[PDB]
């Protein structure tokens, strides 16, 4: 057939580029970074009404100061999350401190290109890694299966990504509050989702310095959805 | 873990104003048997370093080969091997010190005590010690084995501290070393009269003296010594 670690004539790794196509088929995940915190939101996308939606876990805690959202082949993310949690806790063991968000992200991205003929293929999932540390403050990173990671003020991944990213282009400014960011994620998720957005098929989360990483209750998100509807109807 | 078989005794050395001096006798003992009389224990590395070794001779010959190979390896893909990127005394020492500590950490030591003597690129004097345990130290005078007990006291009368180094000439330093070698011949039961001496000067370079002998010895007073107390005849 052909090598797994083969370059194309354009100078790209075939398998890495193909895994990016799998990520485009995944459910939408959005992240927005502010000076009051970083917000993470996801589309749950249940395949059937009998599926208990609260078991869909696409937003995940890595440490108290680091959260993570995923999009693509979500099963592939489990070993990445496991490595991230181990890396975060191991650094706390060796250095008696919280680990930098960038350093954690770099550790996860080191796994990415460990494939050949090590694992047999790249990961088919993208991660939005959000967190806070004392040096660089509130941060949001986009970790790809290429081993590359970019920092972002705001970022959307998944099926409605390019439409959402254009919307985030216009809406984001450096003085956004946390409440404003929450509504903004809900707004853009509602825009790109197939089904109608409610508290059961969408999930919010945030990371603040004080309270750390928190996944929002369905009752708390429901109020933010109701607050969104009223403010859109206000003009 | 082993035991040393064929052994070399003291190596002595000191700094002076423009360089360093190092000396060691030519004997390879086999316990109390003075087996081998033509053993060179000072080994030059380039024209700026001399490694003096005491202890097990088979391990000395091994180290001698590591150093010879080090020179060969440094010349590889190195147009400045006889100039800016030549081997320094500090490079040679750290390599040996690394090897010695690694070998003791595997419980299979090189049963030696080593003094690396030389002059650096910038003209600074280099003199450092390392042994089978990986223990390292530096001083204006250095000596191994018996030399540590008998030579150092004599050499420290010339260079007692760092500030005495510029005040000490090569003629005075050599004289002190040669005297110390005589004292060791009087008092060390595993020493020989024949020895080698090396001078590494920042101006005149490396001078390697072989086939030196202890001379001007005092023995005449022995004729007057009779018995162990009461005996008169």
């Amino acid at each position: 057939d052909r090598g797994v670690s083969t370059f194309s004539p354009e100078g790209r790794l075939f398998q890495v580029e193909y895994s990016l196509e799998a990520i485009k088929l995944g459910s939408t995940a959005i992240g927005i970074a502010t000076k009051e915190g970083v917000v993470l939101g996801v589309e749950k996308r249940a395949t059937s009404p009998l599926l208990e939606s609260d078991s869909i876990e696409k937003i995940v805690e890595i440490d108290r100061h680091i959260g993570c959202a995923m999009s693509g082949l979500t099963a592939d993310a489990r070993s990445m999350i496991e490595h991230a949690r181990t890396a975060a806790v191991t650094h706390n063991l060796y250095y008696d401190e919280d680990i930098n968000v960038e350093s954690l992200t770099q550790s996860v991205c080191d796994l990415a290109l460990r494939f050949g003929e090590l694992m047999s293929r790249p990961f088919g999932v993208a991660l939005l890694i959000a967190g806070h540390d004392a040096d660089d403050g509130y941060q949001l990173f986009h970790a790809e299966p290429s081993g590359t990671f970019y920092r972002y003020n705001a970022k959307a991944i998944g099926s409605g990504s390019e439409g959402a990213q254009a919307e985030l282009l216009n809406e984001w400014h450096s003085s956004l509050t946390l409440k404003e960011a929450e509504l903004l994620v809900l707004k853009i998720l509602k825009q790109v989702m197939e089904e109608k957005l409610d508290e059961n098929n969408a999930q919010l989360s945030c990371i603040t310095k004080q309270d750390g990483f928190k996944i929002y209750d369905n009752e708390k998100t429901a109020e933010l959805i109701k607050e969104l509807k009223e403010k859109e109807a206000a003009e | 873990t082993q035991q040393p078989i064929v052994t070399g005794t003291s190596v002595i050395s000191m700094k002076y104003d423009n360089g360093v001096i190092i000396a060691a006798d030519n004997l390879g003992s086999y316990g109390s048997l003075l087996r081998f009389n033509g053993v060179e224990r000072l080994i030059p590395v380039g024209d700026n370093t001399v490694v003096g070794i005491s202890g097990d001779i088979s391990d000395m010959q091994h180290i001698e080969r590591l150093l010879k190979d080090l020179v060969t390896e440094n010349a590889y893909d190195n147009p400045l091997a006889d100039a800016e990127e030549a081997l320094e005394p500090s490079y040679i020492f750290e390599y040996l010190a690394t090897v010695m500590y690694q070998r003791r950490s595997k419980m299979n030591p090189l049963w030696n005590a080593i003094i690396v003597a030389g002059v650096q690129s910038n003209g600074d004097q280099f003199l450092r010690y390392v042994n089978l345990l990986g223990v390292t130290y530096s001083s204006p005078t250095l000596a191994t084995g018996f030399g540590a007990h008998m030579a150092n006291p004599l050499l420290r009368k010339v260079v007692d501290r760092e500030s005495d180094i510029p005040k000490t000439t090569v003629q005075v330093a050599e004289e002190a070393i040669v005297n110390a070698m005589r004292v060791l011949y009087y008092r060390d039961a595993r020493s020989s009269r024949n020895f080698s001496l090396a001078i590494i000067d920042k101006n005149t370079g490396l001078t390697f003296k072989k086939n030196l002998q202890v001379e001007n010895m005092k023995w005449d007073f022995a004729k007057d010594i009779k018995g162990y107390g009461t005996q008169k005849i």
Binding site: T6, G11, G147, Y150 | -
Partner: protein, 231 residues
Amino acid sequence: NNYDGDTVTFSPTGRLFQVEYALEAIKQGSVTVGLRSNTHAVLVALKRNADELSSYQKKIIKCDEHMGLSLAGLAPDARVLSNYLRQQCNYSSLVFNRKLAVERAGHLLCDKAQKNTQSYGGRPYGVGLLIIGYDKSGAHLLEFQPSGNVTELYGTAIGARSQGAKTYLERTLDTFIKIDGNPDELIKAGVEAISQSLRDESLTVDNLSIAIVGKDTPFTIYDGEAVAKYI
């Protein structure tokens, strides 16, 4: 065509296509410039962003107090090779109490990349590196290609549109080599060199990345408002 499936296969004209395809990844990468005098050596790199919300990908990596490089191509491969250089520089210090010669650092990178071009299963590195350093024989600049070829130069550039900067340096050769004891003027010549490779976009405060090493200057990287002086 039929001979580009893996790195272990020569073509009928004696070419290695997988290595050539890896070389292509460098040409897609953002431009970076290297140049030196007798006292100092300078790296200048144009950083690239994903979009306006994104950060600008870092191009320069420190290897030791006296050595570092800039990258162009696959960034993870630069992380692997720079990590190797960091270890080798470090081995030289711990074992021999000796700062690693820049020329020898190039020989080590060449040999590491070569092994990936002759064996089955693996792949060539998809990145080009510009190594600068100051050692016992003065300032140095090296260019690394993942074919294995390493070249010592007065100045050079790699990445997209790098030919413009390379021509400028070829004209300025006699001038910038003489810039001794003046770091700011040597950087100016580097910033002016990388400017010959720009189209549409210009050098902004979070776009530009500069690094320098010299006689009494440790390898330091300048980003943000620290390079506004040179814009």
